[PDB]
Amino acid sequence: SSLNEDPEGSRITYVKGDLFACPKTDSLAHCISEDCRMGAGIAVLFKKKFGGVQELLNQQKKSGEVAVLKRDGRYIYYLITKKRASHKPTYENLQKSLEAMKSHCLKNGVTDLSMPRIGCGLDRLQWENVSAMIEEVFEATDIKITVYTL
Numbered sequence: 001s002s003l004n005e006d007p008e009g010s011r012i013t014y015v016k017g018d019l020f021a022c023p024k025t026d027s028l029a030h031c032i033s034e035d036c037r038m039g040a041g042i043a044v045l046f047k048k049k050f051g052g053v054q055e056l057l058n059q060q061k062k063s064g065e066v067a068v069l070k071r072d073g074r075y076i077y078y079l080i081t082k083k084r085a086s087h088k089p090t091y092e093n094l095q096k097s098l099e100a101m102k103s104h105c106l107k108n109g110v111t112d113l114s115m116p117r118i119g120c121g122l123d124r125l126q127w128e129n130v131s132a133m134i135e136e137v138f139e140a141t142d143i144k145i146t147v148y149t150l
């Protein structure tokens with residue numbers, strides 16, 4: 001028991017639990033397409049709670065970009081993958097969007113980011129490749145990543 005929240009010296013922390021139960025200082029990230037369809041997978045809850053869908057289209061983000069919304073004091077990262085859900089995202093393009101997250105996080109002082117198992121749903125990706133890539137991109141950052149796995 002320690003009052004300071006220490007990470008265990010890791011990039012991706014695997015925890016089973018609901019992702020929406022995360023703190024206000026801890027930001028959410030997930031992947032979606034350019035068409036932005038939340039009506040599939042975990043994306044549904046983010047649309048409902050954070051009201052991201054229109055705002056994302058309002059900002060106009062396309063493949064290789066990230067759309068972020070400040071909501072409840074935390075950030076919400078929408079990694080824009082490819083045009084639609086029927087399209088398989090590439091890891092390189094996903095990497096592009098991952099880079100944008102780290103750049104934003106460090107800039108604002110966001111040292112806490114949680115995400116679900118991205119690259120494991122309609123995205124059709126292999127987590128072994130996805131996770132390792134995230135683990136490389138964020139390898140040298142003060143960003144505490146925790147994946148909520150259901």
Ligand SMILES: Nc1ncnc2c1ncn2[C@@H]1O[C@H](COP(=O)(O)OP(=O)(O)OC[C@H]2O[C@@H](O)[C@H](O)[C@@H]2O)[C@@H](O)[C@H]1O
Nearest residue numbers: 018019032041042043085116117118119121122123148150
């Ligand atoms: N509220 C939740 N909290 C924690 N975990 C959850 C929650 N809801 C679902 N999960 C679990 O974590 C994972 C949710 O992430 P995914 O949607 O499966 O993976 P992701 O990369 O985010 O999917 C995005 C892809 O599908 C479309 O939304 C979009 O087109 C994009 O390409 C799933 O395995 C699910 O079981």
